[PDB]
Nucleic acid binder design. Structure first.
Ligand SMILES: *[C@@H]1O[C@H](CO)[C@@H](O[C@@H]2O[C@H](CO)[C@@H](O)[C@H](O)[C@H]2NC(C)=O)[C@H](O)[C@H]1NC(C)=O
Ligand SMILES: *[C@@H]1O[C@H](CO)[C@@H](O[C@@H]2O[C@H](CO)[C@@H](O)[C@H](O)[C@H]2NC(C)=O)[C@H](O)[C@H]1NC(C)=O
Ligand SMILES: Nc1nc(=O)c2ncn([C@@H]3O[C@H](CO)[C@H]4OP(=O)(O)O[C@H]43)c2[nH]1
Ligand SMILES: Nc1nc(=O)c2ncn([C@@H]3O[C@H](CO)[C@H]4OP(=O)(O)O[C@H]43)c2[nH]1
Ligand SMILES: *[C@@H]1O[C@H](CO)[C@@H](O)[C@H](O)[C@H]1NC(C)=O
Ligand SMILES: *[C@@H]1O[C@H](CO)[C@@H](O)[C@H](O)[C@H]1NC(C)=O
Ligand SMILES: *[C@@H]1O[C@H](CO)[C@@H](O)[C@H](O)[C@H]1NC(C)=O
Ligand SMILES: *[C@@H]1O[C@H](CO)[C@@H](O)[C@H](O)[C@H]1NC(C)=O
Ligand SMILES: *[C@@H]1O[C@H](CO)[C@@H](O)[C@H](O)[C@H]1NC(C)=O
Ligand SMILES: *[C@@H]1O[C@H](CO)[C@@H](O)[C@H](O)[C@H]1NC(C)=O
Ligand SMILES: *[C@@H]1O[C@H](CO)[C@@H](O)[C@H](O)[C@H]1NC(C)=O
Ligand SMILES: *[C@@H]1O[C@H](CO)[C@@H](O)[C@H](O)[C@H]1NC(C)=O
Ligand SMILES: *[C@@H]1O[C@H](CO)[C@@H](O)[C@H](O)[C@H]1NC(C)=O
Ligand SMILES: *[C@@H]1O[C@H](CO)[C@@H](O)[C@H](O)[C@H]1NC(C)=O
Ligand SMILES: *[C@@H]1O[C@H](CO)[C@@H](O)[C@H](O)[C@H]1NC(C)=O
Ligand SMILES: *[C@@H]1O[C@H](CO)[C@@H](O)[C@H](O)[C@H]1NC(C)=O
Ligand SMILES: *[C@@H]1O[C@H](CO)[C@@H](O)[C@H](O)[C@H]1NC(C)=O
Lengths: 776, 774
RNA sequence: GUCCC
RNA sequence: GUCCC
């Protein structure tokens, strides 16, 4: 098809509408800028490479560039690879950028630069120098940036990238940048708010610094500011997972009552880890529009019970008072001030880490009349006692989150309140809530449940009981009131499936997760009824992964409704022991089942009967990670609606003589990570239904035309070949040609479609291989 | 050293004292008997190979053979590999064995044989034909076995190896085998006890068959029999994990009351899975010496509460009544008959699977006066309630086993009572600390001191696999003043308090592995410094705890010798830039063994080694995805003897190992990405004794890297599964490997050339390189 | 590759 | 390969 092979080791995309030519060279182990980058190129990314220098030749031809992303070509020693340390900082020669008349955005983060690069064109709206070694800002070095709007200078002096001094900012350094909207000086060892900043600021990031005091006029002129983050100045250091130095005498960040008076526009204020003991209402006298307030990781436990400042926050959407507990105090209860009632607009309230023994209904009354409240997060509070029925007054809420507590009778990262910098950029780039009302009781100490535990909660759509201690012979009496429940996450418990009536009271249940309930499945002689499915009339999806199931009293699972079954990490090798026919029809009576996952079941072979016993509408089958050493391909004939076969991470050595003759229906075939050395002569002949084919990470040496007829290849959405053992002799002439000239999408042509030999061409990409010597 | 390279792909061992020459060819992907087997060869093993035939040429020279082990060269379809199925049964030509005048033992199990091989010498004392296809025994075929003593015929007709008919045994087939001691007809589809058997039998195995009835005189003459197993004839099939066909009418195996009268010598009687409802005392009227009785997997729940037969068993060492519960009955308590008191000799009692709600002290009184009782096993009973204090009356017992129950306020295989055949042949723990109370796999959520009142004598407590979610503060085990071993694994330790466990003042070993729960949620306080309070602790296991944070910065002990810290997140604690935890193990002054494998340590920040306590001998950094390693830093570890760096991504070795560590004896670098050795790698590294470089990508090895004055001290040197290039540059290496004394495993199997083309796939032991010397 | 798996 | 890990 193609007349001129694409040899450039970068992805190239046309966005014809927005007039853009996008060249992505992210992570291509480059040591030079590749030649032949299109002249029409507008967005060029060279992130994560080892190009040691930039020069006028770097971009000479590329006069249409609006964005260069040149991050992490020399990342500071402690942030970067220890196996591929950068030897010497990126060198930028003069005039490298002054040519680029249309350049709007320049990223040079993570290059060990000592100074703000000079000679930048006046077109530049965005400059980014995170994780460099620039810790002294001077007015003179900034004059070139007159039209700059966004400026990132953070992560240039902190514990992962130390500069061993205080950050220096000359007086009025930023004042003449009259268009500057966004200024980020986070994670920098700054000692004072730099002044005077231009009144044109919308966003100021000053977090994770050594600022002890805000002067009353530090933000005098900033009438346009929308976001201010002063977090992690005088930090709360208890249980900090980074080196943390508090302000002396447990001082807080000192903020004058009138510091915020100019900030009429402020929408987000962030005062996380500022060791605050008081929130003066006077702060918010002229901020009527504040929406998001973060007061997590302070010492505001007392204040939570007073909190006059809330009376001045009627438009607040989001409030975070997480982790304000006094060290070595375990409060009997939660004292929320009446003031919380004045938060007419509040959608999201979070108070993790108040740390209290017992939660009672009336303690939450300050919230009864917040009409817009969607999320209430009382996680990580070590609550021992809580009558769940209290939440009957909270039908309107989308999520009630009591995760990580000690109870017995819109998602946040695993590390969140204790990350150093949760917004920090990586070198790459730049859940049942949807079912309805969700009660998250995950990670508590619930050993035993009964119906009255759930009295008055019939409105729930999702209950999360993951990671409790539930060890009970559920018999269908325990969840009686949960008439609306669509989703139950019962993972990481100790289900005892003695009774086939387990869960049958949850009459509207669409999804059940009983994964990682392996305990009782590990002791011989225990009765388990896997036939419990029959009683669940609307169940769509069952997850029973990592249950180590090696026995069952019942011989068949039954459902008229079940569409998907995850059965990963069990012992079907033991149930289907060769010679024992009793369980070969375990899934057969799941008549509507379309998706089945029996990966990680130690199936080194499949006894005959397995495929005949599969239910008739099976579409999507995974046998991945089974250590399969053999596979009778013909047996795929029984699976008449099979569309996806995942056989990844096994030990298969062969493909079928003709895939067409094994399955007419099969569209996606995944054989990545096997031991295939060669393909059958007529492998894909007449396999007209085939659309996707992964042969990556095998040991294939040759591919001949017969195996891969073009009337199949040209239907394929994707064909993966990378990481094989290709031999680039004159016998590979067809394959090499076809790869060079095909339209078919083949990932990693630049990176890992490589010759292993013969010696001469070893390690050389096949896309670049010249084989003319074979045609004399 | 060696003048004639060993080219035979079999291990060869001299036992000079017993006059034996042992050749082991087990599992060497052979398709022929190798030539050059020594003539003096006495024991020859060819197990697990693909040799398709035996012939007079097979052993022609080997006239001094006493044992041929030729198992599993053609295993039946369903027992064998499905990826390397055997195409056609083993063919044994006539005269193959008649040469072998001294042959005592012959194993031909697992070869798909259709008939008992003929032509066997009269010297033969043991013949073994398990897992063949021989399901009709004829007197005529056995005449050749006149001097036979041990004869295995089992596993020739059962569900893994079906023959599709009943087993046939001609009348008196075994009678004229006048020396036969041991006969095994297990797992065979036998319908009746074959008669008449020779009176010379000591052991008869008839289990897992289709025997419905014992005739009163089936065992008439067997006055010498010691072991009888009739198990799995009319099996109890509830929750059986194999195809199980009960006798119709829920009938038991029918045993007439006088069936055993001749068996004065019987020591072991095994009646497991015989669907027995009664044990008539009359059975044991003439057996006073019975020692071991298995009555597991019957329906003897009622009988347990009567059990007059025990009055006739004063010499019984071992009794098993496990799994006798009536289906869908959950008894309130255990009714043991008074009769149990008469078992003066009983060392071991097992009653799993009685299935009852509550155990009370007095229910065990029938046992109070059994002086010799060592083991009491009440596992898998779904016991809801048990006052542990009752065991105060049982100080004398070595093990009290309450494992797999439902309690809250030798070792047996994982599958045991429900295996088909627990004795079946393959083709190839805190008990020792003293009194042990095994409470593993219960539902204990909360513990307090009174739970252990009166149990001060305990040496081992196993709480593994409970629900313990408690901020242990050192008050909970107060009474356990003697406890040497605590297994607290698979719980949910909340290490808030650094006084946890401190009351266990005699504790030598603590396992708190797989207590990861509270370690997975940010902002929770954990005191890893709890070790300080544990004055005699030798060994601490805290594996698979996913530990990524700690309030305290150092662990302290004067006593601790071994710390297992596998499966945690030291990569997070030691984040580059954060110096605070680099001395976590430094103050464990007597620590000799440390395991920090599986901690995702892709690199070691500088200071890790300086922070290691001074007497560290044995260090594992396996399975960390290490891509780089500053070998010089090994200088800090002055008493280092073992470094395990297996399963990582290392690409190089140090320029001189001698200049990194003088002390290092064992260096394990298996499963890395090493492509070459440094020029003078091992020069002067005289202390080195073990070196694993297996599963790397090494191409060449030169004499400079591997000087002979080091190599020849090595106990073991592993090289297998590398990328060796067998050009004329490899002349030295190839020569040295061929001629060295040094032990190198897998020379026959996986020390292979990958090239050049010509020599590809060829073993280096067999490589001829004369073309290099013209 | 006789039991485990 | 800046937050993670
Ligand atoms: C942040 O700046 C402080 C001081 O402003 C730096 O600390 C000084 O650094 C040197 C080397 O550690 C010491 O000898 C001085 O004693 C320090 N002075 C003070 C007052 O602490 C600190 O290193 C900087 N932090 C980072 C991570 O670069
Ligand atoms: C044990 O022997 C029985 C006969 O007692 C075998 O069962 C016969 O085999 C075929 C095929 O299964 C049936 O059509 C016959 O009717 C069976 N006969 C009877 C009397 O049932 C059985 O297959 C043998 N067992 C094994 C494991 O090989
Ligand atoms: N799984 C299970 N959990 C229990 O808590 C229980 N109590 C009695 N039983 C009985 O134990 C036998 C083996 O588990 C089961 O068979 P059953 O007699 O129907 O009744 C069962 C229990 N089984
Ligand atoms: N680990 C833990 N388990 C608890 O049960 C508990 N109750 C209160 N707390 C307090 O929560 C804080 C963070 O875990 C701990 O710090 P503390 O204030 O010393 O007291 C602790 C508990 N901590
Ligand atoms: C291309 O660059 C412009 C300006 O830097 C930017 O707004 C646009 O999103 C970029 N797109 C891509 C895909 O790089
Ligand atoms: C709650 O806290 C406030 C402010 O600290 C305190 O004054 C008040 O007495 C407390 N009220 C209750 C109900 O505990
Ligand atoms: C929980 O509170 C409800 C009121 O919603 C009440 O009916 C129920 O009895 C309470 N349960 C307990 C143990 O207090
Ligand atoms: C339940 O909570 C657990 C642990 O907090 C989390 O992994 C899981 O995603 C939650 N389940 C659902 C369905 O959202
Ligand atoms: C379940 O247990 C309840 C009470 O806990 C008992 O009353 C009943 O037998 C069981 N119900 C069903 C539907 O099996
Ligand atoms: C499940 O199987 C058992 C037999 O093992 C049967 O008694 C029970 O009622 C079955 N349950 C259903 C829902 O079919
Ligand atoms: C098939 O199922 C897997 C999970 O088992 C899923 O990730 C994949 O997207 C599915 N594909 C199709 C085409 O149904
Ligand atoms: C496979 O191929 C043969 C010959 O073309 C044909 O007879 C047979 O029906 C085919 N089976 C399928 C399922 O295509
Ligand atoms: C060698 O064969 C004899 C006879 O079968 C036996 O007693 C001895 O234990 C065997 N030794 C080995 C090492 O096979
Ligand atoms: C357990 O038994 C002991 C005596 O062995 C008694 O002192 C204690 O009170 C008992 N505990 C209970 C709850 O019965
Ligand atoms: C404790 O019991 C567990 C769980 O059954 C068992 O695996 C372990 O070996 C026992 N502990 C010790 C130290 O013997
Ligand atoms: C531990 O807690 C118990 C109560 O459960 C308390 O009585 C005891 O004094 C505490 N011990 C220590 C060492 O703090
Ligand atoms: C452990 O360290 C903590 C402070 O981090 C301290 O409270 C406690 O005294 C220490 N405990 C021991 C036993 O050293």
């Amino acid at each position: 098809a193609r007349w001129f092979p694409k040899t450039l080791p970068c992805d190239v995309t046309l966005d014809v509408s927005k007039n853009h030519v996008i060249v992505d060279c992210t992570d291509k182990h480059l040591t030079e800028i590749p030649g032949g980058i299109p002249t029409n190129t507008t967005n060029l990314t060279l992130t994560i490479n080892h190009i040691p220098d930039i020069s006028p030749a770097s971009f000479h031809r590329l006069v249409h560039l609006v964005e260069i992303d040149f991050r992490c070509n020399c990342v500071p020693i402690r942030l970067g690879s220890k196996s591929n340390m950068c030897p010497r900082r990126l060198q930028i020669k003069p005039r490298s950028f002054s040519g680029l008349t249309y350049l709007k955005s320049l990223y040079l983060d993570g290059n060990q630069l000592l100074e703000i690069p000079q000679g930048l064109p006046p077109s530049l709206q965005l400059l980014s120098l995170e994780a460099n070694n620039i810790f002294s800002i001077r007015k003179e070095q900034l004059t070139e940036l007159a039209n700059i709007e966004i400026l990132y200078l953070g992560q240039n002096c902190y514990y992962r990238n130390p500069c061993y001094v205080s950050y220096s900012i000359e007086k009025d350094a930023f004042l003449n940048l009259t268009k500057l909207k966004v200024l980020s000086l986070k994670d920098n060892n700054v000692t004072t708010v730099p002044t005077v900043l231009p009144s044109t600021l919308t966003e100021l990031y000053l977090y994770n610094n050594m600022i002890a005091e805000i002067q009353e006029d530090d933000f005098n002129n900033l009438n346009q500011l929308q976001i201010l983050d002063l977090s992690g100045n005088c930090p709360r250091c208890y249980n900090a997972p980074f080196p943390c130095t508090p302000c002396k005498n447990n001082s807080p960040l000192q903020i004058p009552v009138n510091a915020f008076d100019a900030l009429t526009e402020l929408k987000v204020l962030r005062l996380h880890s500022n060791s605050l003991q008081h929130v003066p209402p006077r702060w918010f006298k002229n901020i009527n529009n504040l929406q998001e307030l973060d007061l997590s990781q302070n010492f505001l436990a007392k204040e939570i019970g007073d909190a006059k400042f809330l009376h001045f926050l009627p438009n607040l959407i989001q409030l975070d008072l997480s982790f304000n507990f006094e060290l070595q105090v375990y409060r009997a209860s939660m004292n929320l001030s009446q003031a919380f009632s004045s938060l007419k607009s509040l959608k999201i309230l979070r108070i993790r880490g108040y740390v209290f023994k017992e939660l009672k209904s009336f303690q939450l009354s300050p919230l009864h009349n917040l009409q817009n409240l969607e999320v209430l997060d009382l996680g990580t509070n070590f609550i021992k006692i809580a009558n769940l029925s209290m939440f009957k007054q909270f039908k309107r809420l989308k999520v009630i989150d009591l995760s990580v507590n000690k109870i017995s009778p819109q998602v946040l990262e695993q590390l969140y309140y204790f990350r150093y910098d949760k917004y920090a950029r990586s070198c790459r780039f730049k859940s049942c809530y949807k079912y309805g009302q969700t009660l998250d009781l995950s990670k508590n100490s619930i050993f035993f449940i009964k119906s009255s535990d759930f009295q008055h909660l019939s409105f729930l759509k999702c209950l999360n009981l993951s990671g409790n201690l539930i060890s009970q012979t559920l018999n269908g009496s325990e969840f009686q009131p949960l008439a609306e429940l669509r989703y139950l996450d019962f993972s990481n418990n100790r289900l005892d499936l003695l009774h086939s009536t387990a869960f049958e009271e949850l009459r509207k249940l669409e999804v059940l997760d009983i994964s990682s309930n392996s305990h009782y499945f590990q002791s011989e002689g225990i009765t388990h009824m896997l036939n419990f499915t029959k009683n669940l009339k609307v169940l769509q999806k069952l997850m029973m992964n990592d249950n180590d199931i090696s026995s069952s009293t019942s011989r068949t699972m039954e459902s008229e409704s079940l569409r998907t079954l995850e059965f990963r990490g069990n012992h079907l090798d033991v149930l289907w022991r060769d010679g024992d026919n009793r369980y070969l029809q375990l899934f057969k009576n799941l008549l509507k089942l379309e998706e089945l996952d029996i990966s990680k079941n130690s199936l080194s072979f499949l006894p005959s009967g397995v495929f005949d016993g599969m239910p008739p509408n099976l579409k999507n089958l995974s046998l991945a990670k089974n250590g399969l050493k053999s596979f009778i391909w013909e047996k795929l004939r029984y699976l008449k609606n099979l569309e996806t076969l995942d056989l990844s991470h096994n030990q298969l050595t062969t493909v079928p003589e003709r895939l067409s003759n094994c399955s007419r229906s099969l569209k996606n075939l995944i054989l990545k990570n096997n031991q295939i050395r060669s393909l059958t002569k007529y492998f894909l002949q007449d396999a007209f239904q085939l659309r996707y084919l992964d042969l990556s990470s095998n040991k294939i040496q040759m591919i001949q035309k017969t195996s891969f007829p073009e009337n199949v290849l040209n239907n394929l959405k994707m064909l993966l070949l990378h990481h094989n053992r290709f031999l680039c002799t004159c016998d590979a002439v067809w394959f090499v040609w076809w790869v060079q000239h095909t339209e078919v999408t083949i990932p990693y042509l630049a990176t890992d479609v490589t010759c292993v030999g013969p010696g001469a061409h070893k390690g050389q990409s096949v896309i670049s291989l010249d084989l003319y010597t074979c045609e004399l």
